[PDB]
């Protein structure tokens, strides 16, 4: 695995026409998957991280937007990163996106972290674009290698014992962090239960406690659920992703929860910026926003 060569070819598109592909070899991509999978399994499923850190939400294969995020936030390892999942699907360059992220995980395994999103799941990414991209540019076997890698991604992270991070949200099943630690990998994402909820649930201001989720899976939770969770676990903030928000970040429940979404102009219903949350060493948080100029 010539890591520096792979990263170099991935970063050669930097400055060129948006949409130009990097066609790594199948062996190089498989090498990224196998080596990153080993590192994921060697680290906890519930990461314990320290600030300073930049935290990013959904990317969805918008590779040049990922490069802009790194340009603004600082390329690894000048800044430490935590991504909240959803690297693939929807966008045109899921492969470049995931390959660069896996390469940085291998290169800087103690300063660069990737959580699992609901799209790092074969049932979802078979439909939402990643299967098609793998079948067109490579083959179906490579898609299955990615699945085996994704099945080993960690599920949540706690920053300085005070910020709880996951892709989706809370679960009505979650009373103890030990319940997360007891999840064994590799695993698929079930359509019900704790792991499903961590990747799929959503906050909702119109629900008292736990409610149904219009997506047809998991649940919604209200502001009082957030407050109770934070108090029970001596936490200050939930940081999650999974929903398109206009400014790239959005608070919920008196700044006790924030949603991050990092793929600009993702939808057709509204323009949206992408945001990252910067957490300094003292846990002071701010947002860096990538906004299309018009």
């Amino acid at each position: 695995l010539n890591l520096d060569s792979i990263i170099g070819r991935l970063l050669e598109v930097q400055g060129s026409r948006p949409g130009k592909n990097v066609q790594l070899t199948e062996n190089e991509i498989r090498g990224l998957c196998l080596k990153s999978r080993e590192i994921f399994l060697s680290q906890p499923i519930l990461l314990e991280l320290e600030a300073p850190l930049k935290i990013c939400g959904d990317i969805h294969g918008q590779y040049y937007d990922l490069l802009r995020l790194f340009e603004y936030g600082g390329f690894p390892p000048e800044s430490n990163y935590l991504f909240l999942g959803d690297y693939v699907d929807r966008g045109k360059q899921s492969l470049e996106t995931i390959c660069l992220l896996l390469a940085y995980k291998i290169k800087y395994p103690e300063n660069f972290f990737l959580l699992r999103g609901n799209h790092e799941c074969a049932s979802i990414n078979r439909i939402y674009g990643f299967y098609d991209e793998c079948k067109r540019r490579y083959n179906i076997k490579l898609w299955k290698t990615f699945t085996d890698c994704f099945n080993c991604l960690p599920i949540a992270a706690i920053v300085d014992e005070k910020i709880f991070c996951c892709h989706g949200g809370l679960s009505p099943d979650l009373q103890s962090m030990e319940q997360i630690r007891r999840i064994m990998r590799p695993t698929d994402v079930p359509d019900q239960g704790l792991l499903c909820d961590l990747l799929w649930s959503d906050p909702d201001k119109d629900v008292q406690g736990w409610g149904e989720n219009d997506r047809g899976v998991s649940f919604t939770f209200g502001a009082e659920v957030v407050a109770k969770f934070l108090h029970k676990h001596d936490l200050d903030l939930i940081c999650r992703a999974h929903q398109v928000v206009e400014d790239g970040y959005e608070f919920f429940a008196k700044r006790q929860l924030v949603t991050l979404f990092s793929a600009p102009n993702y939808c057709g219903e509204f323009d949206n910026a992408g945001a990252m949350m910067s957490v300094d060493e003292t846990l002071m948080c701010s947002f860096q926003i990538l906004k299309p100029a018009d």
């Binding site: 040049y64 603004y72 005070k162 910020i163 200050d236 846990l283 948080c285 926003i289 906004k291 100029a293």
Partner: peptide, 22 residues
Amino acid sequence: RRVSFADNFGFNLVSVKEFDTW
């Protein structure tokens, strides 16, 4: 020290970088 946000202390909460897609 509790988690805080930069606008608690007179800093900008956000910094915005506008970009041209091309």
